[PDB]
């Protein structure tokens, strides 16, 4: 998280820290969220050989009494992630077990698929990842809060696909999610709007985000 | 380390684990080793923005009672490190305090500059580098036992450079040290004669390792 501040430990309970050892055996770093006792959503480009989900943590140094290391089951990747366009960009893990619900470890509310996600909202983005294009990532959770865009700000000034997407990050101030955030949470009114998704490697906003409301009817569907 | 077994903890005092900032915000790894209560020598290669050590460590990933953690504060590099031929591959940390000399944490002696190492010499490289080709890097102390090469094994078949280089390993085993272990010590009759420095991609035997016998004239220098 570029720009942002530390969050206050505990206080966003659903955030999941996934450790991914890709095929080539490198660590990897990715964010997440947890959707039920036994599902997380993240990025589908923080697929891997083999991924651990720690949550309940704040510093993923430190062994706190609160954390719970499980290993995933199912990587489930959107049938139509084209890996190119950056399209769909949306995975669910499932968990090896159920989470104990406590309060360090705890669900976040999706959208309802009606729920869309104005331009002018203010929504807060958080993760492990890097604070700087230069610098790495962090040990502890970081929190940034960020517009949503129009249309305008990421199309003809960029790139884009706007139903499935969010153009989020207005170039006026260096506030981004960069490097190792990507498949964390986009909260707006507390609610999960958006993912992580890609953006500038200049970490230059606006950001893309995938767009949870449309694929709420996925998520169900697979979950059910 | 391909091909090898976990030390038994603890018991090789001199070993460093370096965590390092790489210019693009990268953390990386490396081995090294402990010379002085202030010196630890390390490959040139392992070169970041910024070095922490930890010393006494077998276990990386707990906190153990035997670690010591201190920054570097200077970065020495041999110089005349070239980076096409990879020679030269060696470079002197000095750390910001000096080490506390305990049970689990002292120095490995170093050649006298008349002390060549045969070909034919049974040695021991350890690490906390990748476990395989395609396999993550290791969060305990692994090593193994290569065997030190005539220089036909490296130039006519392949590469080299005698004076300044060690072949290390047969074609007959897939023992090796990977990725993570570079600039780790390799240990012959109790004395520190190589530093893990580059190899085949595959990993495929023979490597090579900077001789320190050589360079003991410079690290007299630098450091005294």
Redesign the interface.
């Known amino acids: 998280i570029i720009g942002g501040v530390e969050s206050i430990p505990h206080s966003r309970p659903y955030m999941a820290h996934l450790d991914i050892?890709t095929?080539?055996?490198?660590?990897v770093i990715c964010g997440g969220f947890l959707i039920s006792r036994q599902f997380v959503l993240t990025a589908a480009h923080c697929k891997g050989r083999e991924i651990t989900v720690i949550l309940g943590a704040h510093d993923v140094r430190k062994?706190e009494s609160t954390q719970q290391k499980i290993k995933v089951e199912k990587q489930i990747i959107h049938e139509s992630y084209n890996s190119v366009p950056n399209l769909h960009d949306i995975m669910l893990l499932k968990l090896e077990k159920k989470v104990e619900l406590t309060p360090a470890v705890n669900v976040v509310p999706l959208p309802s698929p009606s729920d869309f996600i104005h331009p002018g909202a203010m929504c807060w983005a958080a993760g492990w990842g890097?604070t700087?294009?230069?610098?790495?990532?962090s040990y502890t959770l970081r929190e940034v809060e960020l517009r949503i865009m129009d249309e305008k700000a990421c199309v003809d000034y960029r790139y884009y696909e706007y139903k499935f997407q969010v153009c989020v990050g207005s170039p006026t101030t260096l506030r981004a999610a960069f490097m190792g955030d990507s498949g964390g949470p986009l909260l707006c009114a507390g609610v999960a709007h958006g993912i992580v998704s890609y953006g500038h490697p200049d970490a230059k906003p606006p950001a893309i985000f995938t767009r949870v409301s449309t694929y709420v009817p996925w998520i169900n569907a697979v979950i059910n």
């Open positions: 050892v095929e080539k055996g490198l660590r062994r890097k700087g294009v230069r610098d790495p990532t």
